[PDB]
Design a protein around this ligand. Structure first.
Ligand SMILES: CCc1ccccc1-c1ccc(CNCCc2nc3ccccc3[nH]2)cc1OC
Ligand SMILES: CCc1ccccc1-c1ccc(CNCCc2nc3ccccc3[nH]2)cc1OC
Length: 327
């Protein structure tokens, strides 16, 4: 069967932790008082969540309330444990309370207020410097969670809140996050189609933190090339094809051979044969102000089929692309 794989960094962090840290099913949820909060305005919406702006009437401070739909509610213990474990980490949203509506019996997560700039889904809104600066901020959150033994598994623009006035960012929606345990096989039905790594698309279950790095590379490519999304798959099978049209089928086959991965027969008629493209092909007059040799080099080192070859979050922070960012 498939060749086993392990993360090349933070491999055994969970193994060294007491079971209460990662054994989320054993966690006992202490419920707060839902009557401590009054809803003020709607901030946004997710497929399995409703997000509102609220006031904690006990201290008159603004808070963010995330009401959970049944599928999100079933994995509450995991999301709570992960949020509590990461609380106080750089650029991680801060869980303030956990409440339950006695009327609808639905749970909600309360977070400390996050000043959120509404970009209104307009992504041609950042300069080259700002892209580097905010990518560095995302990397701080990813290196932190990976160091704590957690993979986000849903990195995308929707899960990143930016306070553009104070130049601060938060990585949010940890509902799909999981604890990394070497040799564990995970569900590949994670993330959002456009941000899924090749490991998920080829059903390779022994993945790790590097999955997040692929997703981050998808975000970067969409931003520097002004192409939303960068890999525009019609479905999960076509998603790999779109990837293969850029990275090439040769390296894809080398990847599947390395890990002795059995490809699903639908791909036979759809993958074809494609040359690996040079990143310079996506450079045009409308996006040249966002592209530099350092950006293309950095992107190249994230968007690799082989999850073990991609830069880790800390290696990415060392990249020359970030030398211009004030630290
Ligand atoms: C790091 C900048 C960046 C670089 C590359 C590609 C994209 C971006 C980028 C990332 C995030 C955002 C803003 N995302 C807000 C999403 C959001 N608002 C919510 C309100 C309520 C509930 C949930 C929400 N979720 C903009 C970006 O570029 C302009
Ligand atoms: C909205 C209703 C709600 C949904 C889920 C959890 C709590 C509440 C809630 C009810 C009353 C006041 C506040 C509530 O949540 C903060």
């Amino acid at each position: 069967g498939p060749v086993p794989s392990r993360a090349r960094v933070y491999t055994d962090v969970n193994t060294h932790r007491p079971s209460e840290y990662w054994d989320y099913e054993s966690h006992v949820v202490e419920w707060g008082n839902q009557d401590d909060y009054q809803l003020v305005r709607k901030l946004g919406r997710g497929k399995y969540s409703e997000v509102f702006e609220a006031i904690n009437i006990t201290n008159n401070e603004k808070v963010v309330v995330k009401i959970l739909k049944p599928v999100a509610a079933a994995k509450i213990k995991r999301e709570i444990k992960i949020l509590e474990n990461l609380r106080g980490g750089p650029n991680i949203i801060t869980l303030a309370d956990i409440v339950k509506d006695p009327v609808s019996r639905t749970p909600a997560l309360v977070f400390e207020h996050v000043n959120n700039t509404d970009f209104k889904q307009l992504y041609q809104t950042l300069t080259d410097y700002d892209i580097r600066f905010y990518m560095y901020e995302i990397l701080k959150a990813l290196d932190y969670c990976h160091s704590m033994g957690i993979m986000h598994r849903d990195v995308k623009p929707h899960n990143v809140m930016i306070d553009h006035e104070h130049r601060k960012l938060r990585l949010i929606d940890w509902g799909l996050a999981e604890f990394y345990h070497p040799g564990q096989e995970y569900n590949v039905r994670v993330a959002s189609r456009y941000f899924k790594g090749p490991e998920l698309l080829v059903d390779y279950q022994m993945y790790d933190y590097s999955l997040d790095m692929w997703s981050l590379g998808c975000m970067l490519a969409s931003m520097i090339f002004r192409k939303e999304p960068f890999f525009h798959g019609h479905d999960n099978y076509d998603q790999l094809v779109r990837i293969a049209k850029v990275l090439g089928t040769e390296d894809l086959y080398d990847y599947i051979d390395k890990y002795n991965i059995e490809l699903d027969p639908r791909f036979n008629d759809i993958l074809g044969r494609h040359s690996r493209k040079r990143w310079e092909r996506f450079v045009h007059s409308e996006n040249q102000h966002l592209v530099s040799p350092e950006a293309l080099d950095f992107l190249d080192k994230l968007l690799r089929y082989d999850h073990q070859s991609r830069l880790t979050a800390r290696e990415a922070m060392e990249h020359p692309y970030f030398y211009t960012v004030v630290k």
